[PDB]
Design a binder for this molecule. Structure first.
Ligand code: CHL
Ligand code: CLA
Ligand code: CLA
Ligand code: CLA
Ligand code: CLA
Ligand code: CLA
Ligand code: CLA
Ligand code: CLA
Ligand code: XAT
Ligand code: XAT
Ligand code: HTG
Lengths: 206, 196, 39, 151
């Protein structure tokens, strides 16, 4: 009810109480006005956040080590168009069945909170996640950091979601930058650090 | 049984049938009589699929290990027999006409067909539709629920396996066991991806 | 938003999207398997 | 062959049509730089053309004295693709559509305002009834025998 907003001096929408991690009253199109839509959008923002964090780390960490003498991995933008031990389509099929399983059980979880907490083979192992989007258990929370006081959960999930936003924007940034400049993101970072006055986006468009 | 945990099983699948895993997303068995006919059809297609698949894979395996030289299933009909395929077809058609009409009458009316029309002395004990028993069960095994759902399980597996055999032969042009061997050879370079 | 979804479910919009999808499908099929007179 | 027709792979006029077509395309192609887009387009038309004629020849089509593919729909087994098969496919799809629509109309028949869901489509309902069409022959066949098809 009392929280900093994205647009100081504005009234947050009725459906955004502030009980949700990352609530800053931003939904000017009302895309989360309906409870079910808001909920589904929460899950979607979660998975988007985590995939984009994994991705941002996955393109910025290696590219930064590649610029040094530590690694020699090729550009993230062209890492897909190359060949591997098997064709990329086989890898894609395996990815589809595995990730298909995981996303399947997660989908069943979103549509029915309880039904997918137990291991079909060994009924001994279960997940200790209370609310959806946070599976827990030994596999997804071995350090037990997933279960704590509502304050700590609020804080941690807010950190998670924020690093998620930053990551999404970062990955999109990487894509568009490699489209425009034609070089790695680190090269862009160093170019901008070298001359922030001219070496920007207008160094190619104007 | 839950084919899709956790999707609610349809109301007409109350688990009072062997093999009930609540799988009927298109609602084909919404009608009771439809469910009966489809149970029978699943049993029959399943059993014929088990027999057929066994007769397709097993002779090929024994040929591979050099036990007996047996021609593959898709090249077995070509002009090798004494009575020719046409006569064989007439015979087959007749005997199957009789047998299948008989079973059909059993499905339409359970207690109506059980005794030998020639030697009326011999008869089949009143059992379940689709599970005749009597002379069909000389070893007197118990038709338990477990055995039934095992039958249906192996039946479904064998049906899918038959579809697999058909498509695989259609694509590769070799036997199913041959395809299996080539898959064992180099798994990551010998799949449906490379064959198409 | 629910009202907007309801509007998107109205007959002419539903028809535009449905026939749009169909047009796209038939176009792509006729691009990949062109000049089909048999099958 | 059938109806006094000659096979397209053996038809002279068929080949002459392909010839004149390709030659027209090339006669138009002469005016453009080989690397330019018009050139690549016309060439694409040429390749598509010869691939078309070759495919028609391969498919076992019969040609008239005009040099054009004529179709055999009598049920002749050498030409089931010329009507029988695509006919079966059509019937399957049309039956699918009709059966799904029927399902939808029946589903909303017992409601407060049925006409509403006829001008504003219940997309969840429609998506639920969408795939039921896949088994339309089986579903309709059973309804036929049951007496749920007509009144
Ligand atoms: C389960 C049913 C069944 C299946 C899947 C097959 C499958 C086959 N049969 Mg077979 N048959 C079947 C039942 C029977 N066949 C035969 C007797 C033969 C003979 C004599 C021949 C086949 C042949 C074939 C092959 C030709 C493909 C085709 O569709 O022919 C096209 C058929 C139509 C378009 C009708 C194919 C592997 C041929 C083969 O093996 O060539 C290498 C062949 O010469 N079958 C008899 C006894 C009458 C059967 C009884 O049900
Ligand atoms: C999460 C998104 C993501 C995706 C799609 C990729 C994709 C790729 N990475 Mg990258 N990577 C990522 C994140 C990602 N990475 C992160 C966050 C890091 C920092 C740790 C790295 C560090 C890294 C290095 C040092 C290298 C790559 C390389 C690659 C390429 C080949 C990898 C491979 O085939 O091995 C297959 C992967 C495995 C066999 C391991 C997966 C199994 C794990 C351990 C268990 C299952 C996951 C678990 C549930 C969590 C491929 C394009 C290589 C490359 O660039 O080649 C051109 C390469 O040398 N990655
Ligand atoms: C970077 C921001 C961030 C933050 C603050 C969180 C925070 C959280 N995650 Mg999340 N998560 C993230 C990114 C993040 N995650 C990413 C990128 C993925 C995809 C891999 C996930 C996938 C995920 C799953 C499957 C689960 C969680 C869970 C949690 C909660 C308990 C775990 C924990 O305390 O770790 C705190 C995070 C850190 C201390 C940062 C980690 C820094 C490095 C990368 C650690 C690497 C260690 C690893 C072994 C290698 C906590 C709210 C669990 C939960 O909610 O249980 C109820 C849970 O089950 N997360
Ligand atoms: C015979 C029909 C049939 C079909 C079409 C499916 C299909 C599926 N099952 Mg199911 N399942 C079946 C029978 C079937 N199953 C039976 C007989 C059982 C034992 C009762 C199960 C027990 C089962 C479990 C425990 C799970 C599935 C799951 C799945 C999904 C996995 C998706 C994937 O890409 O994995 C590769 C997929 C929709 C998974 C899922 O995603 O559920 C939501 C999952 O966790 N199945
Ligand atoms: C149930 C369906 C089925 C059908 C239609 C066939 C049909 C055939 N089998 Mg097969 N067979 C089957 C199941 C089946 N088999 C199973 C389950 C096994 C494993 C036990 C075998 C093991 C087998 C062997 C070892 C051989 C055959 C052979 C044959 C062919 C000649 C047999 C014959 O006509 O003898 C007349 C029938 C009677 C006298 C009764 C014929 C195509 C023979 C063949 O020529 O292979 C191509 C052959 O050598 N079958
Ligand atoms: C709506 C139905 C529909 C479907 C099923 C597809 C399907 C496909 N399109 Mg797409 N396409 C569509 C509409 C559709 N398209 C529309 C409306 C446009 C205009 C924006 C395009 C513009 C387009 C391009 C430029 C390309 C595709 C390509 C493809 C193929 C990618 C694999 C796949 C068959 C790719 C392809 O395979 O081309 C050969 C490709 O390069 N499409
Ligand atoms: C009403 C009768 C009629 C019939 C039977 C046809 C039939 C055909 N037309 Mg013609 N056409 C018609 C009216 C008709 N048209 C009218 C009124 C016009 C003016 C708008 C045209 C303008 C036209 C053009 C410009 C072209 C055709 C073409 C075709 C062929 C396309 C083959 C195809 O789509 O791949 C197969 C399609 C499918 C398999 C679709 C089914 C896909 C689903 C998803 C399958 C699902 C299975 C589970 C086919 C023979 C093309 C052709 O090549 O002619 C020889 C072509 O280029 N038509
Ligand atoms: C004008 C009326 C007419 C009608 C309704 C048909 C209908 C048919 N023709 Mg026929 N045909 C006709 C005139 C007609 N034809 C004429 C004037 C000629 C030139 C003499 C032919 C030459 C012809 C040939 C060469 C063949 C057909 C075949 C067929 C059948 C298609 C296959 C089938 O049904 O699956 C399965 C078939 C059945 C379930 C039973 C159909 C056969 C029984 C005896 C009737 C179908 C019954 C095919 C056929 O009969 O295959 C078996 C076939 O091979 N037709
Ligand atoms: C930008 C983005 C979304 C932006 C959406 C915004 C701002 C929407 C805002 C709004 O809706 C709200 C909030 C509220 C509404 O009222 C107002 C509007 C404004 C309408 C998502 C990106 C999301 C981006 C994601 C999820 C990216 C994931 C990337 C991955 C996994 C990359 C993997 C790889 O790069 C590696 C790791 C290594 C390579 O070698 C291989 C590959 C595979 C290429
Ligand atoms: C009977 C059968 C095969 C029998 C094979 C035989 C006799 C083979 C004989 C031979 O090989 C031998 C012996 C020796 C060779 O020398 C000669 C031949 C002749 C070649 C296969 C059935 C095969 C039957 C199959 C594969 C059926 C699959 C059906 C599925 C998956 C349907 C699923 C659904 O309907 C439900 C369940 C619920 C709905 O709501 C949802 C959907 C999804 C629609
Ligand atoms: C692929 C299906 C995606 C889900 C369909 C989204 C719109 S669902 C939509 O909801 C409206 C209420 O807001 C109803 O009035 C309308 O009848 C209904 O079709």
């Amino acid at each position: 009810p009392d929280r900093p907003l994205w647009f100081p001096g504005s009234t947050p929408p009725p459906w955004l109480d502030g009980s949700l991690p990352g609530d800053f009253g931003f939904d000017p199109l009302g895309l989360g006005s309906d409870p079910e839509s808001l909920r589904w959008n929460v899950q979607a923002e979660l998975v988007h956040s985590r995939w984009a964090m994994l991705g941002a780390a996955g393109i910025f960490i290696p590219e930064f080590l590649t610029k040094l003498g530590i690694l020699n991995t090729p550009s993230w933008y062209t890492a897909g168009e190359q060949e591997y031990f098997t064709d990329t389509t086989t890898l894609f099929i395996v990815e589809l069945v595995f990730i298909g399983w995981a996303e399947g059980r997660r989908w069943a979880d979103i549509l029915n909170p309880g039904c997918v907490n137990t291991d079909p083979i060994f009924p001994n192992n279960k997940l200790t996640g209370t609310d959806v989007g946070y599976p827990g258990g030994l596999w997804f929370d071995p350090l037990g950091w997933g279960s704590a006081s509502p304050q700590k959960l609020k804080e941690l999930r807010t950190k998670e979601i924020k690093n998620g936003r930053l990551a999404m924007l970062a990955v999109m940034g990487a894509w568009f930058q490699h489209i425009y400049t034609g070089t790695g993101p680190i090269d862009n970072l160093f170019a901008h650090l070298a001359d922030p006055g001219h070496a920007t986006i207008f160094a190619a468009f104007t | 049984g839950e084919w899709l945990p956790g999707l609610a099983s349809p109301g007409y699948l109350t688990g009072s049938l062997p093999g009930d895993n609540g799988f009927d997303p298109l609602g084909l068995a919404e009608d009771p009589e439809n469910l009966r006919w489809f149970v029978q059809a699943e049993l029959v297609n399943g059993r014929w699929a088990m027999l057929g698949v066994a007769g397709m894979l097993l002779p090929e395996v024994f040929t591979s290990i050099g036990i007996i030289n047996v021609p593959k299933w898709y090249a077995a009909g070509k002009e090798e027999y004494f009575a020719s395929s046409s006569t064989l077809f007439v015979i087959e058609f007749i005997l199957f006409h009789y047998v299948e009409i008989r079973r059909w009458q059993d499905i339409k009316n359970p207690g109506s067909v059980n005794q030998d029309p020639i030697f009326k002395q011999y008869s089949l004990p009143a059992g379940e539709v689709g599970y005749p028993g009597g002379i069909f069960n000389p070893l007197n095994f118990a038709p338990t629920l477990e055995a039934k759902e095992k039958e249906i399980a192996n039946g479904r597996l064998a049906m899918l396996a038959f579809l697999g055999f058909i498509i695989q032969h259609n694509v590769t042009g070799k036997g199913p066991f041959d395809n299996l061997l080539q898959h064992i050879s180099d798994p990551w370079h010998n799949t449906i991806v490379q064959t198409l | 938003m629910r009202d907007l979804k309801t509007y998107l479910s109205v007959a002419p919009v539903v028809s535009t999207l449905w026939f749009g999808a169909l047009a796209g499908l038939l176009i792509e099929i006729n691009r990949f398997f062109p000049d089909a007179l048999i099958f | 062959d059938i109806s006094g027709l000659t096979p397209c792979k053996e038809s002279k006029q068929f080949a002459k049509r392909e010839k004149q077509a390709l030659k027209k395309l090339q006669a138009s192609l002469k005016l453009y730089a080989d690397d330019s887009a018009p050139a690549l387009a016309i060439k694409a038309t040429m390749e598509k053309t010869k691939k078309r004629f070759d495919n028609y020849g391969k498919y076992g089509l019969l040609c008239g004295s005009d040099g054009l593919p004529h179709l055999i729909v009598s049920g002749d087994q050498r030409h089931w693709g010329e009507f029988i098969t695509p006919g079966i496919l059509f019937l399957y799809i049309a039956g699918w559509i009709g059966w799904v629509g029927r399902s939808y109309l029946i589903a909303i028949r017992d409601e407060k305002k049925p006409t509403q869901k006829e001008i504003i489509i219940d997309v969840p309902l429609a998506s639920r009834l969408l795939f039921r069409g896949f088994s339309w022959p089986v579903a309709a066949y059973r309804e036929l025998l049951n007496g749920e098809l007509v009144d």
